[PDB]
Every structure is written in C-alpha cells, then in structure tokens.
C-alpha cells in the first residue's frame, strides 16, 4: 500500500499538533512564533522628538538672528522653558521639542553668530521652515496601545527590537519540539571508529540528523546506535516515548529484512499511518503516533536507512512537522520554478526528489532572470555525496522521460535562501 507524497504529507499535517505555549525571556524568544499579541504600553516617541540636530523654532518667525534660550537633547532638558516667537532652542536628533517650538531647522541651514562662549548664544536661521518640519509628534512611529506584534508571528531581529521598544522582556511563545534520534544496525560503528572491521560502516545518519535538527533550532536527545534486536529496539523506543520528547527519529530497520523491527514495534506501540511512499528516494518511510502513558502524543518517523533517503525524508516530512509543532502558520517549504542547466532523466515508477545546486541568474537561459539548477550527479540513495551542497530538491514527475536543458521544473528549497551563493 504505497501512498503518494502529497497524501503522506496531509496525513502527517493532520496528526501534528502545535505544542502548548510557554513563557521565555527576550533572547530565548528569537526564532520562535509568538503565542500572544504585543501592544505598545506607551507611544513612540513618547515626547515630540526632533528628527535633526539643529534648532527648534516658531516656523512663522522665518529667517533671521535669534537668541538660543535652551538646549534639548534628552530627559528633562528644557523642562519649563517655552520657545516664544523671536527665540530658538538647540536640539539634537531624538531631543524633546521644547513647548512653543513647532518646527526644527537642521543645523546645516543655520549659522552661529558671535563669540562662541564669550557672549550669550545667538544663531542665524537661514531658511523659511514650515510648522511640523523635522519633528516626530508623540506616537507617530507607534501609537500607545497599538498592536506591534501578533499571535502567529515569527520573531526575528526587528521583532526583538519591537518587543524591546514595548518593554517586553518575558514573551509567550510556541516552544520548539524536543527530538530523540537513534540509528539502527548491526553493521554500524561509531563515527570515531578508525579501521573498520569486515561488514562495518560508520554511523553517518545519526550525526547528519542531529545536525539537521540543530539547524531547525530544536533540542536533540541522542539515543545512539541500536542493534537489530526486537527487545533492544523496543526498550530504547519505550525509553524515548516516556522521556518527554515530542518527535522520535529512527533510521534503518524499516526495509524488507528479517531483522527490521521498526515497523512492527511502531504498530505495537501506537498507530502507523503509512510505511510505504511513492517517491524516489524514500520509499520505506514510516510514520506513527504514540501516546506516552500518563500524558502526551509522540510522533515517530521511521526514516529510511539509506543516507540520501534519510535526509530527503527529513527535509520533506520532518521539517514541516517541526514547524507545525513550533506554531508556524506556514510550515510548507518554499517551492519555486526554475530552469535546468543540464538534461535530467526522470524515473518511470516514482516521482523523484532530484538533488540540485540552484542559483539566481540575470539570464536563466530564456532572456529573463530566474533560478537555474545543476544536478549533483548520480542520485543513488546510498550516495550521500549527491546531497553535498544541494540547496534544492527538483520535483520530477514519474514520466520516465529525459527533461532537456532549459526546461522548467518545480523545486523545493531546503537550505536558507538568504545564505544562497550568488551567480
């Protein structure tokens, strides 16, 4: 019972539930989705503020020479002083406008007159300004009680700046899921192994997945290598489910071998929604939901053992699940359209997620700017070098035809689009 990827994703989305919100500190809120609206407790600026370094004037006075009656840069500077017609006040950018002044003339349109500090301060205003010029009225950037951030908004640097503006240092957010990761196989040895014994390989999926989960900003619970023994894998899965994690990722032990126990163990512990997906690479992907005994849900992905299939299934299915649990309203990956830089043979049986290195060009080959893709070469699921530098997965339909250079395909972007190397 092999299901299409679109259905497998819908099933995963339907089962995945946003985590309960928590309260975190300002810097812990970075990267998280807001679980409450944020309202400004005071206006910005809270006082009428100068846009410029210069002089606060009565605009109707016009060009002329005037005494400087106060200097206003911050705090109580100029408190109680009224700028009346025929006077001016020195101001710096962000300085409070003294009462009575209704415009600011930038310092470049003024000239200091008389002996610097050996006579009372006088300045020549060189222009005719207009009422309100270069003054930020109270609340013109942010009004008191305005909503500056809303529930469901992801917190980036400017949102941290808005929380700080509003004096919020404890924030209600959706947390990231905690993810347990294990590898399976009698053939595996730790990546610290030197000379390999006959029939041994280094466990590469576990470190790869730990890294992938770290890129998604989740806490990792590293459960190590598990051997192809049903009782042993049951014990580790039972320990993982009762530990408080939200997602368990296993790799391997999910194909057709007589010692592949992931599927029967997930069927016994919880509910397996699927164990076969019509995709290349990634056919053995298994997804299950387990209820931890009181009491919460744990999502389990029995990822394929083949290194490419493992990472592709992580990118397509686990990344949107992490985002959904973390409260993202748009957990789907970015899909763009792009032109192939070389010919690519699609698979005749399953739609292929072909690894590519994509870049934006001024000419994508059709005379207009656009993304272009180069294949990473041989796409065998055992060839982790096919994932090297791959920032996208080309979605090739199961036609079996050769897609020529210059033809357009849909591509899933799997790595930070703002970290893309330019053409």
Ligand X SMILES: Nc1ncnc2c1ncn2[C@@H]1O[C@H](COP(=O)(O)O)[C@@H](O)[C@H]1O
Interface residues with ligand MOO (CB under 6 A)?
Answer: 280-284, 304, 306, 309, 381
Q: In the set 16, 70, 72, 306, which binds ligand X (CB under 6 A)?
A: 306
3-state secondary structure of 180: strand
Determine the Cα–Cα distance for residues 389 and 377; give it in Å rounded to an integer: 12
Inter-residue contact 302 to 267 (CB < 8 Å): no
Check residue 177 for interaction with ligand X (CB under 6 A).
Answer: no
Q: Which helix (H) or strand (E) holds 226?
A: strand 219-226
CA trace torsion 221, 227, 230, 232 (10° rounding): -50
Take residue 198 and report the two structure tokens written for it.
């006959």
Interaction with Mg ion in 236-255: which residues (CB under 5 A)? 252
State the Cα–Cα distance between residues 391 and 411, nearest whole angstrom.
Answer: 10
Q: Which residue has the tokens 């739609």?
A: 351
- Nearest approach, Cβ of 296 to a second copy (angstroms)? 27
Task: Choose among Mg ion, ligand X, ligand MOO, none what residue 282 binds, the Cβ cut-off being 5 to 8 Å by kind.
Answer: ligand MOO
Tell me if 271 contacts a second copy by CB under 8 A: no
Contacting Mg ion within 179-208 (CB under 5 A): 185
Residue 6 binds which entry of ligand MOO, Mg ion, a second copy, none, with Cβ cut-offs from 5 to 8 Å by kind?
Answer: none
309 binds, among Mg ion, ligand MOO, a second copy, none (CB under 5 to 8 A by kind): ligand MOO
Q: Candidates 17-25, 177-185, 232-240, 319-327: pick the segment binding Mg ion (CB under 5 A).
A: 177-185
Residue 212 CB, shortest distance to ligand MOO, in Å, is 17
Choices 105-113, 254-262, 328-336, 405-413; region in contact with ligand X by CB under 6 A: 254-262
Nearer to ligand X, 306 or 341 (CB): 306
Q: Is 209 in the site for a second copy (CB under 8 A)?
A: yes
31: nearest Cα among 298, 270, 231, 323: 323
DSSP bridge partners of 371: 360
* Residue 99 makes contact with ligand X by CB under 6 A: no
Identify which range of 5-13, 271-279, 289-297, 378-386 contacts a second copy by CB under 8 A: 378-386
b vs e for 69-91, b when ≥16 Cβ sit within 10 Å of the residue's Cβ? bbbbeeeebbeebebeeebbbbb
188 is in the binding site of which of ligand X, ligand MOO, Mg ion, none (Cβ under 5 to 8 A by kind)? ligand X
Alpha carbon 237 to its chain centroid, in Å, reads 30
Instruction: Check residue 369 for interaction with a second copy (CB under 8 A).
Output: yes
Q: For the chain, report the end-to-end CA distance as a whole number of angstroms.
A: 44
Q: Which residue is nearest to ligand X (CB)?
A: 305
Question: Which residue's CB is nearer to a second copy, number 31 or number 238?
Answer: 31
Q: Which of 102, 134, 159, 203 binds ligand X (CB under 6 A)?
A: 203
Q: Are 307 and 384 in contact (CB under 8 A)?
A: yes
Cβ of residue 80: shortest distance to ligand MOO, in angstroms? Answer: 30
CA dihedral 92, 94, 98, 99 (to 10 degrees): 150
Respond yes or no on whether the N-terminal peptide bond of residue 342 is cis (omega within 30° of 0): no
Residue 78 sits at φ, ψ, to 5 deg, of 70, 10
Q: Which residues of the chain form contacts with ligand X (CB under 6 A)?
A: 49, 92-94, 183-185, 187-188, 201, 203-206, 251-255, 257, 304-307
């Amino acid at each position: 019972e092999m299901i299409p990827t679109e259905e497998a994703l819908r099933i995963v989305f339907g089962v995945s539930k946003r985590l309960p919100p928590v309260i975190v500190s300002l810097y812990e809120a970075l990267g998280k989705v807001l679980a409450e609206d944020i309202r400004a407790p005071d206006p910005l600026p809270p006082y009428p503020a100068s846009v410029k370094d210069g002089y606060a004037v009565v605009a109707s006075d016009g060009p002329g020479e005037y005494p400087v009656i106060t200097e206003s840069r911050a705090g109580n500077d100029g408190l109680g002083v009224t700028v009346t017609p025929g006077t001016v006040a020195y101001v710096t950018t962000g300085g409070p406008i003294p009462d009575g002044a209704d415009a600011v003339v930038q310092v470049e349109d003024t000239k200091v007159i008389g002996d610097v500090s050996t006579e009372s301060k006088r300045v020549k205003i060189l222009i005719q300004t207009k009422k309100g010029t270069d003054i930020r009225r109270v609340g013109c950037d942010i009004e008191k009680d305005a909503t500056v951030l809303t529930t469901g908004e992801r917190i980036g640097a400017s949102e941290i700046g808005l929380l700080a503006t509003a004096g919020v240092t404890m924030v209600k957010v959706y947390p990231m899921p905690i993810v347990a990761i294990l590898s399976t196989g009698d053939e595996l040895v730790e990546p610290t192994a030197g000379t390999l014994g006959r029939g041994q390989i280094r466990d590469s999926n576990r470190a790869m997945l730990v890294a992938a989960v770290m890129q998604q900003q989740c806490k990792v619970v590293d459960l190590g290598i598990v051997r192809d023994d049903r009782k042993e894998l049951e014990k580790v899965l039972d320990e993982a489910v009762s530990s408080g994690v939200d997602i368990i990722l296993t790799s391997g032990g999910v194909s057709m071998g007589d010692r592949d126990f992931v599927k029967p163990l997930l069927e016994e512990k919880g509910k397996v929604y699927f164990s076969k997906v019509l995709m290349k690479p990634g056919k053995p992907l298994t997804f299950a939901e387990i209820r931890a005994k009181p009491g919460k849900t744990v999502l389990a992905f029995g990822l394929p053992g083949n290194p490419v299939s493992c990472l592709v299934c992580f990118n397509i299915f686990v990344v949107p699940t992490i985002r959904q649990l973390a409260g993202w309203t748009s957990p789907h990956p970015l899909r763009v359209r792009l032109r192939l830089q070389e010919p690519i043979k699609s698979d005749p049986i399953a739609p292929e997620f072909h690894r590519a290195i994509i870049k934006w060009k001024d000419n994508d080959g059709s005379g207009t700017p656009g993304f272009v893709a180069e294949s990473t070469g041989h796409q065998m699921s055992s060839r982790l070098l096919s994932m090297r530098s791959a920032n996208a997965l080309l979605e090739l339909p199961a036609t079996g035809n050769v897609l020529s250079a210059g033809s357009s395909v849909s591509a899933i972007i799997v790595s930070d689009i703002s970290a893309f190397s330019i053409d």
